Symmetry: D2
Subunit: 116 residues, 4 copies
């Protein structure tokens, strides 16, 4: 898949399941257009967000709904969300994995970018 | 009441002269400029706000990571790093937002103390 | 596999390939006995370290040879290695993934623990 | 010349009263005790060594993370967090080892300055 999101829970030592993720793409007029969305699976993964045709060059924002996740668990966290913003596909199509590792007051994120 | 600290995981150093913009969420859900500055030689940015001005609300701290890496001659992944949070009066009074930067990754934490 | 190690490179945005990993287990006499070893694949993964029979309860140390990795790449890093030390299987068999995300002066590690 | 800073990613606070042991690698490859202490109210441990004693070599900083979490009534994954590194005179002079703790994860960085 050209875009995959993986989310882990640093408190539980587990995938972060049922995490809402919203992806936006910056439009010609500088606003953030809704691009795709979904929820992580029981493995903490979200596949199927887009296609190689649809996933054209642009500036994309992957918003990971960490507060909704921590509060669905009955916990009060620090951040509203974790946002990951990046230019994609500007040297041709690539495959992107965005990983996030979550704690109530902290997160870390990395990208793995591969050329098919 | 608000401090930002930025570190460089490639060089093992403070991240110096990084632009940081702070925004407050307005009633209409847009982000309005609140505070900004450049990190110091110690990677810190102090003096952003005062207790009087830093009322409860949703704040966004945008760290211009892309320019930092480019100035070092390194191509990075992210446009910027964003830290978005609610300031809450029933919590401790001083907020430190720390970020640890790599070209394709970052870590951020909050230290909230009294 | 009951024990898997995944290593990522935060500088490259890629799996960390050809990373040596040594696993030790603490003996009755408090020394660190060699348990297993291997190298990460082109996906940054190392499988096949042990079997459920062999992977008994104990205190295990997963040593990730980060300095050898960064210097094989011609780079001078801060740490000698990254060590991950944990009690395993003390409530019965579990499956462990140890993940590490590497930079020259920093690393982060997490565990995912699942019950088969 | 050596400082250790420990933060808690669950509570958003310094990690207070954490035991830290520093070791120096001996000629025979064993680890010999060098310095130890407990983090302060600010999560910091200063006063470990002096410039005179902190010669080039391989050092290990062991942070007793398991006891910290247990005292909070949380079951953690790791026995401890280990940070192993070479002190090198041709590098800057002051080393700060920072660690950010969660029950099943930790992050560590080095800030080496002059
Ligand atoms: C370890 C870590 N991973 N991710 C983050 C975010 C941090 C904390 C940043 C290091 O904190 C320091 C704070 C003040 C001075 C020196 C320091 F190294
Ligand atoms: C170590 C780390 N710190 N911060 C981040 C972000 C990561 C990488 C997380 C990805 O790790 C996994 C990937 C697949 C399965 C299990 C895994 F733990």
């Amino acid at each position: 898949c050209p875009l995959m999101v993986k989310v882990l829970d640093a408190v539980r030592g587990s995938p972060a399941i049922n995490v809402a993720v919203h992806v936006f793409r910056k439009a010609a007029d500088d606003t953030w257009e809704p691009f795709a969305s979904g929820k992580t699976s029981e493995s903490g993964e979200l596949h199927g967000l887009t296609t190689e045709e649809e996933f054209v060059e642009g500036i994309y924002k992957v918003e990971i709904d960490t507060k909704s996740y921590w509060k669905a668990l009955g916990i009060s966290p620090f951040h509203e969300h974790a946002e990951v913003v990046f230019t994609a596909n500007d040297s041709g199509p690539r495959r992107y994995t965005i990983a996030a590792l979550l704690s109530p007051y902290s997160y870390s994120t990395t990208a793995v970018v591969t050329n098919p």
